[PDB]
A paper describes a structure:
We obtained crystals of BMI1121–235 co-crystalized in the presence of the PHC233–56 fragment, which diffracted to 2.5 Å resolution. The structure confirmed that the central domain of BMI1 adopts an ubiquitin-like (UBL) fold. While we could refine the structure of the UBL domain we were not able to model the PHC2 fragment into the remaining electron density. The unmodelled electron density was found in a wide opening between the β2 strand and α1 helix at the interface between the two BMI1 UBL symmetry related molecules. The incomplete model of the complex is reflected by relatively high R-factor values. Superposition of the PHC2–BMI1 structure with the crystal structure of BMI1 UBL shows that the PHC2 fragment overlaps with the unmodelled electron density observed in the crystal. Since PHC2 binds at the interface of two symmetry related BMI1 UBL molecules, most likely in the crystal structure one molecule of PHC2 is bound to each monomer with 50% occupancy. This unusual binding stoichiometry observed in the crystal structure precludes modelling of the complex solely based on the X-ray data. Analysis of the crystal packing using PISA software suggests two possible homo-oligomerization interfaces. The second interface is centered around Ile212 and involves a cluster of tyrosine side chains (Tyr202, Tyr203, Tyr211 and Tyr213) that form a hydrogen bond network with backbone carbonyls.
Numbering used by the authors:
A (entry chain A), B (entry chain A): 127 to 138, 161 to 231
Amino acid sequence: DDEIISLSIEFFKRYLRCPAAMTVMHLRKFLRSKMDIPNTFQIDVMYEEEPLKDYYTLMDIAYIYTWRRNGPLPLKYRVRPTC
Amino acid sequence: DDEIISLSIEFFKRYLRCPAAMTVMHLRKFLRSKMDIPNTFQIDVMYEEEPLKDYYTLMDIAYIYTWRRNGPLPLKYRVRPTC
């Protein structure tokens, strides 16, 4: 979609207006860069307590979690050591 | 003390033989370097669920938590965004 989605992102709060076509993979990469997070760690992007798959678009998230455009889509995130 | 303390460290498992005079501040710095953790984050070193003060020595920890030299001193650690 050619639509803009408003959302927030906090560590398991900054606000974002983004293209709804953007994916979890893109956000993780944005976080990776914003916070300077090394490859020594993994980033889970989550809606509530459940991580999201990397191919999910922000629409998919709104559709899956039946977000009613009441406020920004609340996303959370977290880092784990990788191996 | 001129004594060696055996311990483990895992994210909230690697093993360590260390001088008992070493501090939480030193461990945090070791972790910071080992995992390449940027100043964009803070590191809490913990015994169980409670963080430890940076001046604590590994003895202090053994004395405070009444470790009986049954196995290595189990330490945990965790990262939070700073600000």
